[PDB]
Amino acid sequence: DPKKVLDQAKDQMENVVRTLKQELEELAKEARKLDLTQSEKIELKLRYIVAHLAAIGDIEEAIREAKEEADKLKRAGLVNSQQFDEFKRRLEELHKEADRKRADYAEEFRNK
Amino acid sequence: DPKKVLDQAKDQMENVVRTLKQELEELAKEARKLDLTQSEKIELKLRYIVAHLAAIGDIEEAIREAKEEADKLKRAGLVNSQQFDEFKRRLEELHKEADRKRADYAEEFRNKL
């Protein structure tokens, strides 16, 4: 069901944004610790960069799995050309609106 | 102007959601203080409940006042029918976005406690 594929992706792309929020808040808590060695300060700064790449990457992997799942329904004959082009049209809308919500939290914790 | 009415509901709901945030943070800080009678803990529970019911109700009455604003522009034919459909679609997206943050703050407060 092409509708189920869009809903499956919006759950995953929201779950990635919530995972990003929790990882940035866990780093903000550890930035306040007064007993950070040299090993742990550089680790926290690089973990901040990875937290963003992992969000960008898991957003793309959610779009990729959704685009592959619709191609299977197309090749099976369960989806016509009118449903296919509609599905990519609304997938880009979910792709761009999740790309903003990720930038909204990233701008929120970058103001520290 | 239908876009103004959408943006009025956004700011009115972000204030509601911010007011819950400020209220819940204050309740979190006063919950940890030692020396609390069995009734003082109940008074905080009571202030929490009212804070919750105010957020739920005011989110609802912001959507309702926006719909009554839209139906008032339709009564005088100031809005096209194709617009009226588009306004309802973006209003409930503002509704889902506001209730998500509201339910987050209440859940974030329950975990910290």
Author numbering:
A (entry chain B): 170 to 281
B (entry chain A): 170 to 282
Publication text:
BCL-2 protein family members BAK and BAX are the gatekeepers of mitochondrial apoptosis. Homooligomers of BAK and BAX form pores in the mitochondrial outer membrane (MOM) and release apoptotic factors into the cytosol, committing the cell to destruction. We use computational protein design to generate high affinity binders of BAK and BAX with greater than 100-fold specificity for their target. Both binders activate their targets when at low concentration, driving pore formation, but inhibit membrane permeabilization when in excess.
As a starting point for design, we used as a scaffold a de novo designed protein BINDI that binds with high affinity to BHRF1, a viral prosurvival BCL-2 homolog. BINDI has high stability (resistance to thermal and chemical denaturation) and therefore is likely to be tolerant of the mutations necessary to enable interaction with BAK and BAX, and we demonstrated previously that the three-helix structure of BINDI can be redesigned for altered BCL-2 family specificity. During the design and evolution of αBAK2, we generated two lower affinity constructs for BAK, αBAK1, and CDP02, which bound to BAK with Kd values of 7 and 60 nM respectively. Five rounds of FACS under specificity-enriching conditions yielded binders with high affinity and specificity. αBAK2 binds BAK with 400 ± 200 pM affinity and 333-fold specificity. αBAX2 binds BAX with 3 ± 2 nM affinity and 100-fold specificity. αBAK2 differs by 12 mutations (10%) from precursor αBAK1 and 22 mutations (19%) from BAK-CDP02. αBAX2 differs by 10 mutations (9%) from precursor αBAX1 and 18 mutations (15%) from BAX-CDP01. Crystal structures agree with the computational model and confirm the BH3-mimetic binding mode of αBAK2 with BAK.
